[PDB]
């Protein structure tokens, strides 16, 4: 499938603008896609382990919140 | 109508090296200090103490941030040190003191062979109509240590007062012990 290119250069530039970045190197978009795909795969992998254990077929938002709290990255606003 | 009196003692000790140092020519070590007269914690109301030295040193304006406030240094001549005590409350005017750094003994004290030179003076910081915060800080001062607190200068007189007990007890103990041991061995 290979749809890691949905996170496009304009999107990475918007995320950099929000983060204060005011100039971005050319090879910063092929870096950020590898950095984001490792972070996603880690939080999804833990959300699918909290979903298999509950004998459920749909990854609910609670699974994502629990798996995100496992990494330390704590997000407020989705029932946890 | 609130007046708070805080007793303190500020001074300097000095130790003679016995010979002039070849590295810098200094002849004495000295420690300049402010400490409380009572066994109380100055840090509850003192933010810092600045000591301004003679312009011969690489930096003349020294700073200390915890009681008993003191600086240890070396020198060969006497000079006036300006001690500026700042309080935690910025609205309170800091106190200014002038201490004549004494390093040399008088003829009478030199003849007595005393190992240390001391010059210290007693003063009372008076806070008249202090702010609520400053008043609370001055009234909430805790005890500094569980041990005793004491004063040194006239150093020769204090040393003699100490020895008037020390040598008496030592001689008593020595003679009594010698007598006991000799009598017991003779039997």
């Amino acid at each position: 499938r290979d749809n890691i290119q949905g996170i496009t250069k304009p999107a990475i530039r918007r995320l950099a603008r929000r983060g204060g970045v005011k100039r971005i190197s050319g090879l910063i978009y092929e870096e950020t896609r590898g950095v984001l795909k490792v972070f996603l795969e880690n939080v999804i992998r833990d959300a699918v382990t909290y979903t298999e254990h509950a004998k459920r077929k749909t990854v609910t938002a609670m699974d994502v919140v629990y798996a995100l709290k496992r990494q330390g990255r704590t997000l407020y606003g989705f029932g946890g | 109508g609130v007046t708070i009196v805080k007793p303190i003692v500020y001074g300097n000790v000095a130790r003679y090296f016995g010979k002039k140092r070849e590295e810098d020519g200094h002849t004495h070590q000295w420690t300049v200090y402010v400490k409380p007269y009572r066994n109380e914690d100055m840090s509850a109301y003192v933010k810092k103490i600045q000591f301004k030295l003679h312009e011969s040193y690489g930096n003349p304006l020294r700073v200390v941030t915890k009681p008993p406030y003191e600086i240890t240094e070396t020198g060969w001549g006497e000079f006036e040190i300006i001690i500026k005590i700042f309080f935690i409350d910025p609205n309170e005017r800091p106190v200014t003191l002038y201490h004549l750094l004494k390093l040399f003994q008088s003829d009478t004290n030199a003849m007595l062979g005393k190992k240390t030179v001391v010059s210290e003076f007693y003063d009372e910081m008076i806070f008249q109509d202090p702010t609520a915060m400053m008043q609370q800080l001055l009234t909430t001062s805790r005890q500094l240590t569980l041990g005793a607190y004491k004063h040194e200068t006239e150093f020769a007189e204090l040393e003699v007062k100490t020895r008037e007990k020390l040598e008496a007890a030592k001689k008593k103990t020595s003679f009594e012990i010698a007598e006991l041991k000799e009598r017991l061995k003779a039997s």
Partner: protein, 94 residues
Amino acid sequence: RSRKESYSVYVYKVLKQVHPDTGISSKAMGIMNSFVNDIFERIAGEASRLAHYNKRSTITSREIQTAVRLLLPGELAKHAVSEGTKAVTKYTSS
């Protein structure tokens, strides 16, 4: 009814004291709901471990106070401890 209980009735009761005319959006109210579940579990877990440290088998108010001391930055802890101790003092007299 029951199903899903939450903090919403206390995040809005306490908000009407600080700012009588300010409201709160459903999303922001949800965020406050979530935030309280964070601190509750943090303080209670550190208090359970504290009970485990001095080998008590009970979480008393002393354990909770020491758990509050371990998490709040100074002024925050110094005012939270006062809040808790005043509440416990006033609840023991009634």
